[PDB]
Enzyme design. Structure first.
Site, PDB file in Angstrom:
ATOM      1  N   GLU A 138     -15.136 -56.524  14.307  1.00 32.94           N
ATOM      2  CA  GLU A 138     -15.314 -55.100  14.590  1.00 32.94           C
ATOM      3  C   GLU A 138     -14.904 -54.181  13.439  1.00 32.94           C
ATOM      4  O   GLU A 138     -13.982 -53.370  13.563  1.00 32.94           O
ATOM      5  CB  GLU A 138     -14.579 -54.724  15.871  1.00 32.94           C
ATOM      6  CG  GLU A 138     -15.235 -55.273  17.121  1.00 32.94           C
ATOM      7  CD  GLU A 138     -14.514 -54.837  18.369  1.00 32.94           C
ATOM      8  OE1 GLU A 138     -13.308 -55.122  18.468  1.00 32.94           O
ATOM      9  OE2 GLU A 138     -15.144 -54.215  19.249  1.00 32.94           O
ATOM     10  N   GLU A 182     -18.134 -63.277  21.616  1.00 33.81           N
ATOM     11  CA  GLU A 182     -17.378 -62.914  22.818  1.00 33.81           C
ATOM     12  C   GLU A 182     -18.338 -62.698  23.980  1.00 33.81           C
ATOM     13  O   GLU A 182     -19.374 -62.046  23.823  1.00 33.81           O
ATOM     14  CB  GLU A 182     -16.546 -61.642  22.591  1.00 33.81           C
ATOM     15  CG  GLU A 182     -15.546 -61.750  21.457  1.00 33.81           C
ATOM     16  CD  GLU A 182     -14.834 -60.460  21.129  1.00 33.81           C
ATOM     17  OE1 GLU A 182     -14.778 -59.557  21.993  1.00 33.81           O
ATOM     18  OE2 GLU A 182     -14.300 -60.359  20.004  1.00 33.81           O
TER      19      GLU A 182
END
Ligand SMILES: [Mg+2]
Ligand SMILES: [Mg+2]
Ligand SMILES: [Mg+2]
Ligand code: NA
Ligand code: NA
Ligand code: NA
Ligand code: NA
Ligand code: NA
EC number: 3.2.1.23
Lengths: 1011, 204
Positions: free
Chosen positions: A449, A525
């Site tokens: 991220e 994820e």
């Protein structure tokens, strides 16, 4: 100089990164991986003083110990010793966002150690210190003199102390800073802790030394031949008599050896590396490494003289395997992987971010026992022992650079900035230099991220150049950028598109076939496991199995990030973000694990195990077809147990050895099963049992299971006509039904069954009423708060519609007498401020057998948000020890998470019917239940239920599980229908349409009698 | 059909008939139907139907009731999906509204006769003096399911006396992904094992 506020300074006087060294002076010790006397642990009791800022540190600390200082165990996080509060935050930074500057109030940890060094270590060779993990930055002193500086909390920092140490007593002084410019690249969503949290050691090397070595294994087309190539680098004085021997061992057998003097091949116009040599060893029919069979060799690198004198030895475990992407598929040893992965942060409820072998081994065992084959190092390089254990137990590892800049606006602000390229490069390069020899590492990750910037593209290419043996992945900037070999989205759904601007999360099936797209897709994820979650998990695995290029994913995540706090009586309870006085916080969003912090499983773990099974089953008549999903191993530790039961009563069972090749099939013909005498449904259950113990499991371990309905005989035989006739007694306030000793009381003002008696014993504490709400799950709530309401969240839609406040208005309440029964007819309307939300129409039929047949027909207004449940509830007077049911179990199961559950007769203590989620919610439901037994009561039908000492109201109103109190009697929730739990993510509605209660009209029926 | 139960109870303002049937084939019970008929002082007959279907029997084509009415009326009026023939897996084109068509429009003249003319999602049906209310699928024609099944060509069909009415609580999909293998998707098969529907029959 304030080096901790300068991205141009990430280290001062730091030594080069390298694979794990031990500097053995004995080759046999290197072969056997025995402890080395040249590698000394400095772990134990240190001195510590906390300061609010580096300026507040007195100059006397450099030379002399502080009297105010306490003695602490190292490694440790100083927040775990209560020096300051561990801050928890998700997207937002815990500090003011102004790069590269950090707060002036910067908590400073002053560590020191007085220790002995023997003259022999200083007379010759090189003595270095190794700090495996310091958060987030530190200056180092030795005997008052300044040595160096280091950043990156998740990789070892090494310094030459040869010129600093003296024979005898020595003092180290370590000034650790909580905040640095390094913090901008360390914005992971976890607890913000600090200190010397990984090992400290001293390493002695000779001056003429092995400084680096790389191991590669290349193969022919069918993997029957291999070449092990070992590049060895040296430091010190080059001499012609110098030699390097690389030896390869399979257990105690040496399979290959090669010796050469220094001097590599010519590489350019200036020649080659005089300080390097490359040895090539041929290996015939190598035993290959995989998660299925973690075959390891030992490579021993000896630096010596031509006449046979050893200078030093280094070594590593070697796994012979090839990782490549071909025609859009990720392959290991020529075979397409199916990643049964999980994300694992390094977390311990007592020690914080300090990791130990026992915990690591405990995690690996539980993972493998629950059919995981892969782990992602979210979101940083791990403690060095993790890779050793994954090498040996067999788990595929995604090794991830310690780079996360989630709080930046936009997310790529730093990663697209060339001024931050040096600091980012170090986090990638030093990870590769450390971990490149571990066979368990199959994929490199550029971090997490941090958007997508040009720095990612630069570092992607760096890895590809230096290590072509492993694919590179990275999710930032839309999961499919030029910096990733694998489409690796987070929380992309199976069938549903989420078309966000710039960074859409497509349906994973859709994503693969977008114009021009050819890459494999493995979710970095997915299946957010927050609270009562993992609804829809089976949908992912069906897709994974159907689509070749969908090659699995990593569940978020392994372990709840709760910490232990104590009350007045010294009793421990699990604390999340906000319990430690930290603000602003992100509440219970640190707890998304498949296991609790103490590694006790959540119910969701069994759903994961079942879906990640390595054997697939089909039934055709009497034939069971077993398909192996293994790629390499035969089923040489597997026995199939089959059982046939009629409504929980076993009628036949047997066992058959499994002999299935990888990807192969076995047909198992069941013997002639005798037709049952009784009415009911026959169920077939199969399970795969491991008769022998392994390194990761005990004998008798169940690895796979499946169920089918066989023949059903519908009950047609009329029960013997009951002689007893129930009698109706009417008053203005009550309809009362009498059958001998038994009494049923219906309140005429409310329209509900208000009481039942057996003799003088009352059965109810609260009347039997309709229920359309549940205590909201974490998924029902999402990111909605009291101050920041998310009107889209299920709980807020329900609240705004008045579901929780809905008041029953009586429309009809009549009593009729039949020839052999009493019939009670009721109708209620649930209204919120003039709006009818639900209508419930019921009949209660009580006959001479004492059975109360309840029929329920519900109308749900099409324009009200779909209800959490459609059921009945009551508070029973009884508290009984056991709960016995014929239905899905034994564990908690919900409509979109019930695949792992099996239909059988189950019997558990009452406490096992409650799931102690740290944030209390609707819990403990069991679905597909045909019979429930509790104390004197029996309920029959086709329903979902939970049963506990806690009302839905208390679960909903209580913040933590440790604040719950057992209420009088037992709260029973019996649902005709229950909404899905969702979990694709936990910040937006994720309950799929097929699990929402949208039919408009619903029917269910129950029978209540005495057992 | 094997009768298991047929009772009558006189109530305060109603008469309640209770029935139970079992459909069996060579010792095997395929379906069980349990019903109550409540006739009240307003002249309305509420029919409650609860059906069990053996899990190991092939999922049935429909779960409903049928009869042959003596009346032949000119029009059919309903509140439901229409105006054209629609089935559970072919009803997206149909719209919920008040529809009124000649009886002949409620029959689809497929060259090879079959089940035809169903309208789904119907909350009210009117034919002559009769009204049925609930949440059901229906077809209505001068041709029995038996005749349609036994007649090879549409031109060989003869209008029977009165009007055949099939009212379904539940009806299976028609499929069509191909026409040489089962093509009805799982979500349109009648596999729930237990089925409930309720109808009110009254006079207009
Ligand atoms: Mg700096
Ligand atoms: Mg199953
Ligand atoms: Mg439509
Ligand atoms: Na796949
Ligand atoms: Na989290
Ligand atoms: Na076996
Ligand atoms: Na709560
Ligand atoms: Na025909």
């Amino acid at each position: 100089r304030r080096d901790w506020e300068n991205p141009g300074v990430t280290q001062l006087n730091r030594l080069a990164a390298h694979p794990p060294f031990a500097s053995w002076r004995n080759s046999e010790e290197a072969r056997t991986d025995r402890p080395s006397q040249q590698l000394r642990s400095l772990n134990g009791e240190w001195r510590f003083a906390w300061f609010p800022a580096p300026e507040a540190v007195p100059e006397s600390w450099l030379e002399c110990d502080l009297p105010e200082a306490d003695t602490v165990v190292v490694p440790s996080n100083w927040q775990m010793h209560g020096y300051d509060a561990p801050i928890y935050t998700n997207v937002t930074y815990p500090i003011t966002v102004n790069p590269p500057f950090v707060p002036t109030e910067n908590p400073t940890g002053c560590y020191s150690l007085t220790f002995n060094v023997d003259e022999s270590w200083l007379q010759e060779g090189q003595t270095r210190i190794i700090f495996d993990g310091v958060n987030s930055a530190f200056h180092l002193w030795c005997n008052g003199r300044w040595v160096g500086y280091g950043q990156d909390s998740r990789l070892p920092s090494e310094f030459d102390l040869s010129a600093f140490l003296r024979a005898g007593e020595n003092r180290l002084a370590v000034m650790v800073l909580r905040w640095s410019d390094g913090s901008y690249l360390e914005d992971q969503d976890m607890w913000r802790m600090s200190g010397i949290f990984r090992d400290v050691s001293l390493l002695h090397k000779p001056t003429t030394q092995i400084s680096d070595f790389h191991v590669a294994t290349r193969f022919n087309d069918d993997f029957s031949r291999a070449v092990l190539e070992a590049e060895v680098q040296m430091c010190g004085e080059l001499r012609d008599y110098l030699r390097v021997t690389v030896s390869l061992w399979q257990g105690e057998t040496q399979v290959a050896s090669g010796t050469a003097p220094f001097g590599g091949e010519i590489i350019d116009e200036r020649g080659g590396y005089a300080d390097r040599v490359t040895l090539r060893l041929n290996v015939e029919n190598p035993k290959l490494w995989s998660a299925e069979i973690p075959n390891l060799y030992r490579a021993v690198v000896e630096l010596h003289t031509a006449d046979g004198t050893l200078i030093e030895a280094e070594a590593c475990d070697v796994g012979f395997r090839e990782v490549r992407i071909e025609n859009g598929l990720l392959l290991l040893n020529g075979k397409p992987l199916l990643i049964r992965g999980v994300n694992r942060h390094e977390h311990h409820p007592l020690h914080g971010q300090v990791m130990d072998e026992q915990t690591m081994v405990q995690d690996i065992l539980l993972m493998k026992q629950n059919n995981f084959n892969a782990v992602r190092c979210s979101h940083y390089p791990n403690h060095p022992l993790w890779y050793t254990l994954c090498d040996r137990y067999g788990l595929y590892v995604v090794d991830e650079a310690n780079i996360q800049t989630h709080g930046m606006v936009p997310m790529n602000r730093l990663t697209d900035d060339p001024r931050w390229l040096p600091a980012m490069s170090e986090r990638v390069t030093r990870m590769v230099q450390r971990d490149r020899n571990h066979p368990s590492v199959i994929i490199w990750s550029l971090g997490n991220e941090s958007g997508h910037g040009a720095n990612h593209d630069a570092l992607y290419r760096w890895i590809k150049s230096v290590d072509p043996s492993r694919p590179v992945q990275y999710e930032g900037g839309g999961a499919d950028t030029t910096a990733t070999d694998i489409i690796c989205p987070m929380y992309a759904r199976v069938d549903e598109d989420q078309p966000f601007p710039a960074v859409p999360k497509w349906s994973i099936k859709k994503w693969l076939s977008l114009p021009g797209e050819t890459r494999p897709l493995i979710l970095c994820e997915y299946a957010h496991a927050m609270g009562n979650s993992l609804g829809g998990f089976a949908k992912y695995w069906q897709a994974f199995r159907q689509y070749p290029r969908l090659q699995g994913g990593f569940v978020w995540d392994w372990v709840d990030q709760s910490l232990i706090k104590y009350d007045e009586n010294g009793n421990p309870w699990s604390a999340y973000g906000g319990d430690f006085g930290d603000t602003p916080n992100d509440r219970q969003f640190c707890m998304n694990g498949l296991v609790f912090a103490d590694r006790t499983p959540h119910p969701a773990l069994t759903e994961a195990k079942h879906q990640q099974q390595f054997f697939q089953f089909r039934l055709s008549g009497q034939t069971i077809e077993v398909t192996s999903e293994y790629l390499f191993r035969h089923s040489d530790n597997e026995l199939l147990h089959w059982m046939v039961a009629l409504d929980g009563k076993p009628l036949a069972s047997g066992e058959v050895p499994l002999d299935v090749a990888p990807q192969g099939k076995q047909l198992i013909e069941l013997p002639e099963l005798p037709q049952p005498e009784s009415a009911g449904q026959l169920w077939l259950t199969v399970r795969v049992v491991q008769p022998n113990a392994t390194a990761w499991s005990e004998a008798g371990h169940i690895s796979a299971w499946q169920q089918w309905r066989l023949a059903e005989n519908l009950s047609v035989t009329l029960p013997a006509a009951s002689h007893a006739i129930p009698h109706l007694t009417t008053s203005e306030m009550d309809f009362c039904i009498e059958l001998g000793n038994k009494r049923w009381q219906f309140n005429r003002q409310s329209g509900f069954l208000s009481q039942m008696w057996i003799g003088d014993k009352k059965q109810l504490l609260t009347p039997l009423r309709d229920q359309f709400t549940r205590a909201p799950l974490d998924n029902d709530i999402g990111v909605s708060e009291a101050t920041r309401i998310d009107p889209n969240a299920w709980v807020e839609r329900w609240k705004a519609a008045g579901h929780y406040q809905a008041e029953a208005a009586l429309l009809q309440c009549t009593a009729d007498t039949l020839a052999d029964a009493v019939l009670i007819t009721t109708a209620h309307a649930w209204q919120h401020q003039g709006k009818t939300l639900f209508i419930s129409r019921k009949t209660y039929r009580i006959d001479g057998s004492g059975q109360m047949a309840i029929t329920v027909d519900v109308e749900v207004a099409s324009d009200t948000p779909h209800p959490a449940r459609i059921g009945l509830n009551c508070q029973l007077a009884q508290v009984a020890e056991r709960v016995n049911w014929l239905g899905l179990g034994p564990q908690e199961n919900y409509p979109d998470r019930l695949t792992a559950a099996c239909f059988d007769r189950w019997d558990l203590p009452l406490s096992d019917m409650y799931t102690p989620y740290v944030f209390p919610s609707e819990n403990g439901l069991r679905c597909g239940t045909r019979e429930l037994n509790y104390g004197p009561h029996q309920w029959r039908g086709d329903f979902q239920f939970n049963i506990s000492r806690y009302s839905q109201q208390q679960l909903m109103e209580t913040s933590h599980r440790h604040l719950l109190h057992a209420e009088e009697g037992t709260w029973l929730n019996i649902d005709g229908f229950h909404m899905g739990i969702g979990g694709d993510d936990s910040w937006s509605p994720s309950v799929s349409a097929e699990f929402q209660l949208s039919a408009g009209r619903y029917h269910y029926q129950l029978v209540w009698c005495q057992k």
